[model samples]
Target: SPTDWVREQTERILEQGTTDGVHVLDRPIVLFTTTGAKSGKKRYVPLMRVEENGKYAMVASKGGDPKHPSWYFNVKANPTVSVQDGDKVLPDRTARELEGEEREHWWKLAVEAYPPYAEYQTKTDRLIPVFIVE
Candidate 1:
């Protein structure tokens, strides 16, 4: 399942067989393929390329929207995910929602990678959720 722009990004990756050359605001992105929360179908989500210590972070900012992105539920329902970075595809990675200091650390990395995330937090009353994939 994909939205208009999300579908476009996924299509580009599918057609090119990689996640290269597809960027948001000149920043690289990684693709996470997750199972739909209710539909039980595949969902392609492109997230900022935020990585540290060989792990990647999934920031559920929704561009500062109040509600979490739809894929957040999908990932929560099915933690099994596949990651695509550049031309490399890593399959069957587990996505765990982080908490406490872990969440804070990854949040720092995420904001560093994508500065807009900091502003996104300010735009919404809800705390942005974050997940780690490795």
Candidate 2:
């Protein structure tokens, strides 16, 4: 269900060249492009927007799913990815799994941006991950 919803939003972004009508509730969406871990194919993920000082954090909340999202592995396997914020596409970027203070900062920003993230954390046994992009 999440994958299908993401695909629908991504398709809207691709067709419009921007995230216009689609969003995860009220939070804005970004087109996250990553290389597949297994297939070696380019994968496009639509995530709720979270950014600070030109950097981004990919919050793998997965709506409190029991397992980590597939893109979590794909990102670790291939850290190089692109992010589309509005019409601008930030390509040739690298992803790093955030930890400690850095992670706390992004995590705060993420929860602030999307308040449901705090709730999502409670639904799963595993701690949701936050990956910063640069």
Cα-lDDT of candidate 1: 0.82
Per-candidate RMSD, Å: 8.2, 8.5
Residue pairs in clash, model 2: none
lDDT of 2 by residue, 1-134 (tens): 99999999978756675443442223398878898767778878889899998998899877777688878987998999888787676886999998888898998999988999999988987778899998
TM per model? 0.78, 0.78
What's the lDDT for candidate 2? 0.83
lDDT of each: 0.82, 0.83
For 17-76, candidate 1 gives per-residue lDDT tens digits of 544344222238888889876777877898899987667899987877778898898898
Q: Compared to the true structure, candidate 2 yields what TM-score?
A: 0.78
Least accurate 10 contiguous residues by lDDT in model 2: 18-27
